């Protein structure tokens, strides 16, 4: 920018979307990456592999296409995250993918976070992924219990639209139960 000698960062570094130092350490495993990403409203999980002209996504799952199996709840929470991971995980198994390493991008490794929920989901789908159980939220929270008990302090329905008043972690069970099922159109 200033002159001939000026040094402009790599594009994805300017955009502040790719931590290249973390990326290298990640790519060293030689395994595919389980890309866990978040949006204010959605959660995405991708199984990316290295390629000659750029990465290759062999399977993915977006919280949006979660409804395609019977999801009538919001898509920016724990139950949403876990399920999206499981879906992507299952699709991954179908593609022949057997193992991966969790890539959480610029998100923080906070215990019980959603990226770890995504990870737990993928692991349950049958994917072998280096993890640490006690960094994963305890079952109930993944189910969405923390949200139900929150709506208990009602007086005003947590959810605007009507999915339900006291919400349902039971819906979480139905959807998971539905995915672990062999049939299911992936």
Site for another protein in 50-79 (CB under 8 A): 50
| Number of Cβ within a 10 Å radius of residue 70 | 11
CB neighbour list of residue 16: distance below 8 Å, 6 or more residues apart:
106
Q: Which does 156 bind (CB under 5 to 8 A by kind): RNA, another protein, Cl ion, none?
A: none
Give residues 49-78 in contact with RNA (rule: CB under 7 A). Answer: 51, 53-57, 60, 62, 64-65, 73-74, 76-78
- The site string for Cl ion over 19-48 (x = CB under 5 A, - otherwise) reads ------------------xx----------
**Strand, helix or coil for residue 90:** helix
Given the DSSP bridges, would you call strands 33-38 and 43-49 parallel, antiparallel or unpaired?
Answer: antiparallel
Tokens of 51: 């390629």
User: What number of helices (H) and strands (E) belong to the chain?
Assistant: 7, 4
- Euclidean distance between CA atoms 2 and 75, whole angstroms: 45
Q: How far is the CB of 15 from RNA (least distance, A)?
A: 7
Q: Token match 């979660």: residue?
A: 66
Q: Which one of residues 69, 112, 124, 178 is an interface residue with RNA (CB under 7 A)?
A: 112
Give residues 108-127 in contact with another protein (rule: CB under 8 A). Answer: 108
Check binding of 91 to Cl ion (CB under 5 A).
no
Check binding of 176 to RNA (CB under 7 A).
no
Give the residues lining the site for another protein (CB under 8 A). 4-7, 9-10, 15-17, 20-21, 23-24, 27-28, 50, 105-108
């Amino acid at each position: 920018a200033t002159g001939p000698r000026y040094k402009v960062p790599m594009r994805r570094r300017r955009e502040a979307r790719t931590d290249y130092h973390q990326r290298l350490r990640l790519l060293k495993s030689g395994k595919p990456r389980l890309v866990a990403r978040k949006s204010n409203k959605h959660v995405r999980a991708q199984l990316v592999t290295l390629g000659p002209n750029g990465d290759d996504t062999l399977a993915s799952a977006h919280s949006s296409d979660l409804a395609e199996y019977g999801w009538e709840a919001p898509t920016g929470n724990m139950p949403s995250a876990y399920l999206t991971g499981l879906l992507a995980g299952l699709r991954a198994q179908e593609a022949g993918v057997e193992e991966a390493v969790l890539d959480i991008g610029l998100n923080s490794p906070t215990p019980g976070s959603k990226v770890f929920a995504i990870q737990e989901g993928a692991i349950d789908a049958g994917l072998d992924i280096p993890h640490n159980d006690d960094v994963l939220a305890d079952w109930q929270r993944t189910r969405g219990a923390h949200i139900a008990e929150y709506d208990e302090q009602l007086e005003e329905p947590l959810y605007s639209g009507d999915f339900d008043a006291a919400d349902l972690p039971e819906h979480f069970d139905e959807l998971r139960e539905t995915l672990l099922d062999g049939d299911i159109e992936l």
